[PDB]
Amino acid sequence: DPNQYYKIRSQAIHQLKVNGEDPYPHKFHVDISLTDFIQKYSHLQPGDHLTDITLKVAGRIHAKRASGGKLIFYDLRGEGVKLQVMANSRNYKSEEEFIHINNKLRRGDIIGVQGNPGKTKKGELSIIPYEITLLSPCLHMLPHGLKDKETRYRQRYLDLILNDFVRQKFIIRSKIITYIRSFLDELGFLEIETPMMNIIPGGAVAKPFITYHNELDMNLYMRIAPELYHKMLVVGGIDRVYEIGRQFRNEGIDLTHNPEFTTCEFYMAYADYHDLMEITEKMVSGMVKHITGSYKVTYHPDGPEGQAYDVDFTPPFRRINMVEELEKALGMKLPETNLFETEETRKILDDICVAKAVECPPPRTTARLLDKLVGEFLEVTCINPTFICDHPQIMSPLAKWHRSKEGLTERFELFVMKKEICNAYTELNDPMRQRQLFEEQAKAKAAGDDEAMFIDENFCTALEYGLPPTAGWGMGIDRVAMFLTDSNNIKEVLLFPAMKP
Amino acid sequence: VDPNQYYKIRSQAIHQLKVNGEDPYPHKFHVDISLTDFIQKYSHLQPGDHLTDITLKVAGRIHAKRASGGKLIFYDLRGEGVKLQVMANSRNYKSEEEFIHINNKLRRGDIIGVQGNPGKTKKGELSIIPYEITLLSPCLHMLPKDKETRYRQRYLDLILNDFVRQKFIIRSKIITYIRSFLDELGFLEIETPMMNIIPGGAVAKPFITYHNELDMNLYMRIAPELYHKMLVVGGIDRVYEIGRQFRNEGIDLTHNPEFTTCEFYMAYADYHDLMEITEKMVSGMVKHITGSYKVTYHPDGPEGQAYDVDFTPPFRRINMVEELEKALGMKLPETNLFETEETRKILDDICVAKAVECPPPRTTARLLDKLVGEFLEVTCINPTFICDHPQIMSPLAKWHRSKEGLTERFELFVMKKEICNAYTELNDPMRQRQLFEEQAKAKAAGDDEAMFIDENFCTALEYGLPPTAGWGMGIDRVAMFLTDSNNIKEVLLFPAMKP
Amino acid sequence: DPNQYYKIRSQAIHQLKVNGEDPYPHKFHVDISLTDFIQKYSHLQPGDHLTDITLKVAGRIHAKRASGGKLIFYDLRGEGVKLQVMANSRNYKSEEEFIHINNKLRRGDIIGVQGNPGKTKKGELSIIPYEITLLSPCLHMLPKETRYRQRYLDLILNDFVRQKFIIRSKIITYIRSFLDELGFLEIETPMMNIIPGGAVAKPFITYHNELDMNLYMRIAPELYHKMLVVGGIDRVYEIGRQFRNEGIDLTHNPEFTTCEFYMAYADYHDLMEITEKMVSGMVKHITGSYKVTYHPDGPEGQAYDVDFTPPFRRINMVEELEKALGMKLPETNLFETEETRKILDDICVAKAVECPPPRTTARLLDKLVGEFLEVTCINPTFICDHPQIMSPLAKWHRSKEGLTERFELFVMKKEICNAYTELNDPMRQRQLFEEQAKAKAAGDDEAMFIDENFCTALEYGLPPTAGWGMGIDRVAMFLTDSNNIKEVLLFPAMK
Amino acid sequence: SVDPNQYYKIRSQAIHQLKVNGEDPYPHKFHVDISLTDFIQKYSHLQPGDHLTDITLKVAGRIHAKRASGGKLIFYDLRGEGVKLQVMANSRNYKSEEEFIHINNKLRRGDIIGVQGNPGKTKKGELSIIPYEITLLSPCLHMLPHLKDKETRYRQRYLDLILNDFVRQKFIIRSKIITYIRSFLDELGFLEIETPMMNIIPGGAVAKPFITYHNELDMNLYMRIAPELYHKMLVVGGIDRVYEIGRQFRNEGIDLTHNPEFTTCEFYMAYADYHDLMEITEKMVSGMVKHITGSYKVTYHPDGPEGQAYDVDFTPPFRRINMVEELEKALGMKLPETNLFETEETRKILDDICVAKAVECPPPRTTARLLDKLVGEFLEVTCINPTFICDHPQIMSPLAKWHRSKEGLTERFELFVMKKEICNAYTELNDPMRQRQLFEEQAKAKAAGDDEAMFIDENFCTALEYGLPPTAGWGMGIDRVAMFLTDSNNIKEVLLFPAMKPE
Ligand SMILES: Nc1ncnc2c1ncn2[C@@H]1O[C@H](COP(=O)(O)OP(=O)(O)OP(=O)(O)O)[C@@H](O)[C@H]1O
Ligand SMILES: N[C@@H](CCCC[NH3+])C(=O)O
Ligand SMILES: [Ca+2]
Ligand SMILES: [Ca+2]
Ligand SMILES: [Ca+2]
Ligand SMILES: [Ca+2]
Ligand SMILES: [Ca+2]
Ligand SMILES: [Ca+2]
Ligand SMILES: [Ca+2]
Ligand SMILES: [Ca+2]
Numbered sequence A: 001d002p003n004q005y006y007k008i009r010s011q012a013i014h015q016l017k018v019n020g021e022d023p024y025p026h027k028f029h030v031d032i033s034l035t036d037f038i039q040k041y042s043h044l045q046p047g048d049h050l051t052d053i054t055l056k057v058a059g060r061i062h063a064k065r066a067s068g069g070k071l072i073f074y075d076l077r078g079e080g081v082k083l084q085v086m087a088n089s090r091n092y093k094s095e096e097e098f099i100h101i102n103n104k105l106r107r108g109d110i111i112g113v114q115g116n117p118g119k120t121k122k123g124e125l126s127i128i129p130y131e132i133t134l135l136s137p138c139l140h141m142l143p144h145g146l147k148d149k150e151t152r153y154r155q156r157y158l159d160l161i162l163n164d165f166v167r168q169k170f171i172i173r174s175k176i177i178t179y180i181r182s183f184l185d186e187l188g189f190l191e192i193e194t195p196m197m198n199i200i201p202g203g204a205v206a207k208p209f210i211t212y213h214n215e216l217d218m219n220l221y222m223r224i225a226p227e228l229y230h231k232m233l234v235v236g237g238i239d240r241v242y243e244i245g246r247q248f249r250n251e252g253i254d255l256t257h258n259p260e261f262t263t264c265e266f267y268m269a270y271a272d273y274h275d276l277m278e279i280t281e282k283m284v285s286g287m288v289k290h291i292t293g294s295y296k297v298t299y300h301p302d303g304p305e306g307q308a309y310d311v312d313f314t315p316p317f318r319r320i321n322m323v324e325e326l327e328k329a330l331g332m333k334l335p336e337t338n339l340f341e342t343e344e345t346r347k348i349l350d351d352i353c354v355a356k357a358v359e360c361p362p363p364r365t366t367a368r369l370l371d372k373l374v375g376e377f378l379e380v381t382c383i384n385p386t387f388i389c390d391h392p393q394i395m396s397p398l399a400k401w402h403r404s405k406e407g408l409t410e411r412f413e414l415f416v417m418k419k420e421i422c423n424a425y426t427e428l429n430d431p432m433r434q435r436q437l438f439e440e441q442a443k444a445k446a447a448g449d450d451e452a453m454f455i456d457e458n459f460c461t462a463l464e465y466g467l468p469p470t471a472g473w474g475m476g477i478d479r480v481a482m483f484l485t486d487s488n489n490i491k492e493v494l495l496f497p498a499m500k501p
Numbered sequence B: 001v002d003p004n005q006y007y008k009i010r011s012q013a014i015h016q017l018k019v020n021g022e023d024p025y026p027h028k029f030h031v032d033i034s035l036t037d038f039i040q041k042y043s044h045l046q047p048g049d050h051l052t053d054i055t056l057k058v059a060g061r062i063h064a065k066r067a068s069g070g071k072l073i074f075y076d077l078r079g080e081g082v083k084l085q086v087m088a089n090s091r092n093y094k095s096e097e098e099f100i101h102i103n104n105k106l107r108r109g110d111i112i113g114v115q116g117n118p119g120k121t122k123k124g125e126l127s128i129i130p131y132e133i134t135l136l137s138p139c140l141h142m143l144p145k146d147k148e149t150r151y152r153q154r155y156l157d158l159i160l161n162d163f164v165r166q167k168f169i170i171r172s173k174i175i176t177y178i179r180s181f182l183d184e185l186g187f188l189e190i191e192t193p194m195m196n197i198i199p200g201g202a203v204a205k206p207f208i209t210y211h212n213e214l215d216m217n218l219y220m221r222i223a224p225e226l227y228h229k230m231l232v233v234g235g236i237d238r239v240y241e242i243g244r245q246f247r248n249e250g251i252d253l254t255h256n257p258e259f260t261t262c263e264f265y266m267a268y269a270d271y272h273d274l275m276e277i278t279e280k281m282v283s284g285m286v287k288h289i290t291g292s293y294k295v296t297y298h299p300d301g302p303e304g305q306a307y308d309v310d311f312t313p314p315f316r317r318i319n320m321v322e323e324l325e326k327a328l329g330m331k332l333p334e335t336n337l338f339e340t341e342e343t344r345k346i347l348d349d350i351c352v353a354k355a356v357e358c359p360p361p362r363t364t365a366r367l368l369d370k371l372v373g374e375f376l377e378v379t380c381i382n383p384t385f386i387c388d389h390p391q392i393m394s395p396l397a398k399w400h401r402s403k404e405g406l407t408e409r410f411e412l413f414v415m416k417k418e419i420c421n422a423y424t425e426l427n428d429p430m431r432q433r434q435l436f437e438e439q440a441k442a443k444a445a446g447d448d449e450a451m452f453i454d455e456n457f458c459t460a461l462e463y464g465l466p467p468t469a470g471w472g473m474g475i476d477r478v479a480m481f482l483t484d485s486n487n488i489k490e491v492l493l494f495p496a497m498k499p
Numbered sequence C: 001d002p003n004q005y006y007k008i009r010s011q012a013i014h015q016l017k018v019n020g021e022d023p024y025p026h027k028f029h030v031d032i033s034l035t036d037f038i039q040k041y042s043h044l045q046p047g048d049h050l051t052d053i054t055l056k057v058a059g060r061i062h063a064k065r066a067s068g069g070k071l072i073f074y075d076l077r078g079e080g081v082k083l084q085v086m087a088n089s090r091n092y093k094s095e096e097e098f099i100h101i102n103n104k105l106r107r108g109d110i111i112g113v114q115g116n117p118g119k120t121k122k123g124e125l126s127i128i129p130y131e132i133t134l135l136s137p138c139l140h141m142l143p144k145e146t147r148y149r150q151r152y153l154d155l156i157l158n159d160f161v162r163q164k165f166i167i168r169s170k171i172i173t174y175i176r177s178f179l180d181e182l183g184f185l186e187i188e189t190p191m192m193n194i195i196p197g198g199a200v201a202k203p204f205i206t207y208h209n210e211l212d213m214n215l216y217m218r219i220a221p222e223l224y225h226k227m228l229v230v231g232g233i234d235r236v237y238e239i240g241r242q243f244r245n246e247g248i249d250l251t252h253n254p255e256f257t258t259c260e261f262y263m264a265y266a267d268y269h270d271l272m273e274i275t276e277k278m279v280s281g282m283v284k285h286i287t288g289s290y291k292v293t294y295h296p297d298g299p300e301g302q303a304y305d306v307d308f309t310p311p312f313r314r315i316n317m318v319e320e321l322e323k324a325l326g327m328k329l330p331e332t333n334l335f336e337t338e339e340t341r342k343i344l345d346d347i348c349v350a351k352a353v354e355c356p357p358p359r360t361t362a363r364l365l366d367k368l369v370g371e372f373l374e375v376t377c378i379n380p381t382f383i384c385d386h387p388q389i390m391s392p393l394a395k396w397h398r399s400k401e402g403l404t405e406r407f408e409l410f411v412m413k414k415e416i417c418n419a420y421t422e423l424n425d426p427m428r429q430r431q432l433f434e435e436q437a438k439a440k441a442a443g444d445d446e447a448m449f450i451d452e453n454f455c456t457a458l459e460y461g462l463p464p465t466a467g468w469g470m471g472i473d474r475v476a477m478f479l480t481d482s483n484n485i486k487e488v489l490l491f492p493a494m495k
Numbered sequence D: 001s002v003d004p005n006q007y008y009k010i011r012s013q014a015i016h017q018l019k020v021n022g023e024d025p026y027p028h029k030f031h032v033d034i035s036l037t038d039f040i041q042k043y044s045h046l047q048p049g050d051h052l053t054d055i056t057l058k059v060a061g062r063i064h065a066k067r068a069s070g071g072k073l074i075f076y077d078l079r080g081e082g083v084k085l086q087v088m089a090n091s092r093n094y095k096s097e098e099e100f101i102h103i104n105n106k107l108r109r110g111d112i113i114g115v116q117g118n119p120g121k122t123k124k125g126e127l128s129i130i131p132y133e134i135t136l137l138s139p140c141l142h143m144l145p146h147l148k149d150k151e152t153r154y155r156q157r158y159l160d161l162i163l164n165d166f167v168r169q170k171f172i173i174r175s176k177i178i179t180y181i182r183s184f185l186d187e188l189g190f191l192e193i194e195t196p197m198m199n200i201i202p203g204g205a206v207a208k209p210f211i212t213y214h215n216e217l218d219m220n221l222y223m224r225i226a227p228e229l230y231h232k233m234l235v236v237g238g239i240d241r242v243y244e245i246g247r248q249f250r251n252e253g254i255d256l257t258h259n260p261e262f263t264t265c266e267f268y269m270a271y272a273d274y275h276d277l278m279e280i281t282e283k284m285v286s287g288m289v290k291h292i293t294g295s296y297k298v299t300y301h302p303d304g305p306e307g308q309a310y311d312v313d314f315t316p317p318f319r320r321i322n323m324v325e326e327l328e329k330a331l332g333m334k335l336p337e338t339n340l341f342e343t344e345e346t347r348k349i350l351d352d353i354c355v356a357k358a359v360e361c362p363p364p365r366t367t368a369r370l371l372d373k374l375v376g377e378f379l380e381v382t383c384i385n386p387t388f389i390c391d392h393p394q395i396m397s398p399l400a401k402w403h404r405s406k407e408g409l410t411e412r413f414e415l416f417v418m419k420k421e422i423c424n425a426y427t428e429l430n431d432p433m434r435q436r437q438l439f440e441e442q443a444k445a446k447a448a449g450d451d452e453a454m455f456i457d458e459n460f461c462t463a464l465e466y467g468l469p470p471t472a473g474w475g476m477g478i479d480r481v482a483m484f485l486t487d488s489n490n491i492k493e494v495l496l497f498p499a500m501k502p503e
């Protein structure tokens, strides 16, 4: 019984303490890691037992198997690897200390082991200990944080101990971010840090978190995006900047959303969105190949017991135009794109949503109705990497008008395995038009839209100093790690995901 | 010229270009070569040269416009911290009529594209001779100094002050160095929550916010420390995170409410081991970035006192209580008595006698810290480890091996400022609880910075955290001392400003 | 004296082996190069002595200078760099060992130094020895043809020499990366041939005993490269040695290095452009500029800057020859007649242009171009459209009868490149071989042998292709301002 | 069916007719827009039945096959760059119907052609170009084999490369080996250098040289056996790290693993010893196999395709055996003390052992040669995985430094892989007096009989008198490495134009 186990084991190590036995020693000198030990001694023959090499290793006891009173086997784990400790009475510093030490040890315990390399008749690489030291006891009975999702996510440390697939997803997450940095560093992007607390949040349509600063007596918002700060640096004459950082959205959690999440944004002066499409294909495909070995990954939309898809990251990625493809999916013609800002188009998209059973919680604005329709008809068909391009201006308040198609913008979004990955556009750099677009956002806000943008006059002022033609880009790191690890739940790729209380 | 007037006039001029179909903000200008690479490629031309056979496109911002007789205009084109002269005469331009038209259009501050031939003036100034200039983005204001202005419009600061970009390149090299140093040592770069039901890991006043879908309060993190230790329990022996933290407190020359730290945790290490990796990282960082192990610093501004600071290892070490007794000329209580009300009174009397301020609450930890700040930390010009902090100041640090009442802790001080905080980690779950219970008592007796009880973290400790040592470093603070900046606002792109 | 020194030093060294003090120890562990030591401690100040740290360095002693009896300065050199050893008795292992090592050491000796970084009051970066170990004694007294016969002395004493060879090797690395990026395959073809071919030159002959068979050293890789193009490898290159049995002079060595490359579907116009891109990019990248200063008459002569900015000047051989002569030559379609040989012979006599026998059209013509055209070529200059009578492997010119699609690059008066659209018609190639063989039979030692399995390969279909070959040694000469090729060969052929 | 000699006669006469009629069967210039490789990459996404009227491109290649399908439809199998593209020649898409039959009537398998036309894909999903115009660039006057015969493959490599794509891939592997080594050495600061291939005195190895004569200088010259001595003279010059990848020449017999000119990489590293070099060799060889191959494991067919297949594991560290101890173990008997390996007695002992063990050794039956035959028989043959054979006797190693603890031995190793010697390395002998005595012992042997023994090199000994720093050097056969990385048992497989016994 777990609770009784805890009471018993807690009382025992408490006894060790008051009697001065030091169950939490300060320092154990490790000579070699378990990984290096296995690399250096795997070549031994079964039955071997080295007399001229003694080493100190450490790890956690995963299993304790008695073989008579004279012989115990410890399954010792660390670094994603394992090493057997063959504790034989005859090789220990003394037979009485052998009994004493092994009677204390339990599964879960962190230990230090001083011993000789060996291999059993079976051929299991082992260390035969002269001395075993308890470094940290485990006061709890470990799961025979095992399969129950909830326990795994609330106690990630148990998950990481018991399930090596979990450690592997977090390694690849680190490689994603590291790959992106060298990719951008090599292209001359300067890595920067902009404020995560804003008097006025910006850079996206989203509901922010609000705080208060006592000394300065002001309310602050947690950032939605670093976008506006980045463009001000480009006005400043830093032509290539990027930031990999946390963004915060005051919204609900589900399979693809956490209230804090990581993105990479970058801004490149003298680029347009066509250039970013090629950079994107290059970065994403190079990234998949680098870490997984090929351009093809397997996709299980329905878990391990469902259909398996091979997703091909070989460039170039498919491109669809948002308004055209939607009309095709609808089998019906939408208004001319120059009419996408009229109330009548709004009514038309509203009627279409009712008729097609596409829900849209209030406000039923053109932007939100459009996005719901695109989510239903286009996004779900994006298995392979696909750019959805040319977003209407009404859904894109900071993108530059498209140069040949009235009412549209130079904007794309990358979709992979039904999930949005990147959002990019050539940047709106006309201050008068940016201001008019902010004002529309402000009136939507005043009319009951929690997510609408605040007018940022200080940013419009910066645009009045001259933002060179620029293209910028934003990628959700968590989303990429999801698809590179074939995870359908974002909680798989965050170490400590946000959780219902 | 009234700037308001200039703005109003240029705004009109540019509105007119839009209504004339002369789009002043074009979509795409194809730059063939950066200014930096243009300079390095043609840097060996001779005075008077004009390579009519090669044609390139460059771009940048106009920093000066200077006419010279209606058929010859020079634009000082800048970019990437560098300059190139545009020498435009009408003979070489696409058209004489187009030549007049573009010059009448352009102004100082405008971003432009230049298509033209490499060349050099008889004076020996590298130049490009334009066939065509394109307005890419007009500057609607007249361009200009004083700190306020530079910090509130960092883009102006960056355009006019070249030293500014340089400080920020130093900062990004600091960070790239640390990642590279740690990655080589097999540390895994990770990300832990910046929003917590319970903030912990430091002594600090947190920001609080509200998540309405879950109907619950959340604190912005003050440190990632407890999360990192839970990852060590889970068998990731070495982790680090370079990330923002948040503190609801006053701004000053060394404090911003949000700031960047590197924290790392390595199993099987103790604080002595960390003293060694710290010397190698900081010393090697200083040398790699500034070419030398020596940095001169100006606490009193330019034309002030100028200490030369020596980052050669080993760093000097001092014991907190031992040295405080010396700096003071008196014997303090024995370290095993630091929990008593008698000690607090002794410490309080001292602070009154030496005129050391200590806002309420006047607790032992707070009185000590004030005393150490004025007696020890001021003397730390060269990198100096202050070690062996009392336990009442270090609720998450492991007890000292031999000195009762002390802990295995150090702080790294450079130029009178705290850079690092590190210790052998407390891994005994029952001892950690006791120490949280005292933090919660301190919080209820007036201390806004005192820690909350984190039972979930205490539970993690009950599974078995191996002996471990952890470390935290203020990146902004490193940036300050590697750029000779006395104000943290110099090393933050957009520092927090009073409204 | 030198002979005495040798004899005395040899006995001293011999005495050390017999005293169990091995003057040639097996292994000295070097902690840090001299170059890195200098980069690491450039920030020290006068009087500094980092007793904290102890490094091991190594080098050749260039000077031994004792002040008193408890202090000595060794000028340690290595890697084109130098470091002062400040040996003093108080810091050395012991006073007894300090005298012993100093009595033992001499100028020239290779030594290992274990010590602390430091600086003298005078400001010189130093290492202060705990211990100095003799690594390899120099048994001789240290000090153009002396430099060339003992290139190891030259390299010890003249810092400029290693810099030229570093440039030489940078030239070659650059050419491999240029061609590798263009998709060329780096290959290796035989240097020993039954029939030598691919150039007009006199070959070396040797004998393979096992096979009882005469073999020639290659004069060019060209025919094998073309056989690779027939085989479907569209782009091949080889940077290797060629051998010619001929006299030495300022620009000629009996063995030398060429880069040759062949590209299918190219002609000599495409290769002119690649030549400009490669040579100009090479000059700019190595030196730092497209301009190189050239001293034709040594350092105490006139200096003319040479401009490697593309495009290079082009001259047509026959058109410019006619102008530099101030006279009309035979029509280019009459170049195989006996009349025109006599015309050309007469012109060489009238202009005092030497031409040793055989006085054939191809040789009379080459002499004339050498003296009238090639001397004007200081800036990189292409000489184009060579007559067919001097170009047996080149494809005929498609507009000018008698000429071929050929060029040679000239830089600072000397031939650097030879390139052309390749002849790929096997019957025409055979014809031209047959005429080479008649030239051979009539006095010309450089004339080609008939290579019938090359003509057989051409019968399978060589695609239209263009080939190119550059003398690497001559590129090194003009990039190091050397007028003597012995300057850019480590071990040049010496009489 | 037509006979090869007749086919050649007929095709030659036809091509000659084109020439005299002014028809241009060998045009100067065809502009190629795109390579077959880029065409395939750019257009493979097309769907079956597709035909772009939107893109016109010019490609080129050699006809591998010509198959009619009616009279108005011809399929050409076009090959280049190790790759393949179908030319769907359709009468109705060609520039005209009369020009269509005219061009196809003259084209044959083997011909080099240029093709202008549109991308397309057949119903079967076969990527094609649909020509508007096909141009003969170069006719093939011979029938191509309708191949496997080694001798034809090696005497006419251009055919082997045309017909057998496994052959291109071997030579690609070989270029990657060489390119890998340069980057490895350059990155460690080695200076790539070139030293004389013609020597007044050859040296640097025991081998029989080629001899030639320089007329102008009236001098006999030898082709180089090894660059070794020139390299060590550069290390005395203060160039601490030098390497050279170049041709060596040996006047000896040809067989499965020997060509009379072959390629080695030699490098010298000042302040290194042969232990340092074992570690670098492991690093280099194991990284090279993984880089080129994808893993540390390679398959080895000692007996050809239809024989046993061994996995050879290049995972470091490599096995080490000491030459003399392992030899005694294989013999099951004790040899003389290593300090006795220079005596006549020891020679007689080795001679008797060779007779008794059926180990042949042609004259001269010297100790070095008898030991080497015994090591070949009993040790080298067992080296399948990369194996260092170590600490050769001084009598076999005239240029290697004596061993620091084992009298009679040297600090030398050789790397064997799949039964073949790959590398030869040692701590260099830098004592000029000992070097000179070792040369005189070689010269004594030369005058006694063996034409492989070394010449005394007094210029080199003089260089050693100026001080050669302690150094280790290293020599590797590129051809040998290329053999084992492509699983070839015959060196002819990895030389473009191997030496061959006369016609
Ligand atoms: N003996 C030599 N030494 C060095 N380089 C040579 C030698 N012979 C020829 N070359 C170089 O090799 C290149 C191609 O060989 P080619 O047969 O055209 O030489 P070449 O015309 O005989 O040279 P030159 O006229 O200088 O004697 C030449 O352009 C030249 O750069
Ligand atoms: N979390 C600490 C830094 C690391 C302390 C050592 N575990 C702080 O904020 O001060
Ligand atoms: Ca979306
Ligand atoms: Ca989006
Ligand atoms: Ca502090
Ligand atoms: Ca602190
Ligand atoms: Ca010549
Ligand atoms: Ca010539
Ligand atoms: Ca020539
Ligand atoms: Ca051998």
Ligand SMILES: [Ca+2]
Pocket (backbone or CB within 6 Å): D414, D421, D424
């Ligand atoms: Ca050998």
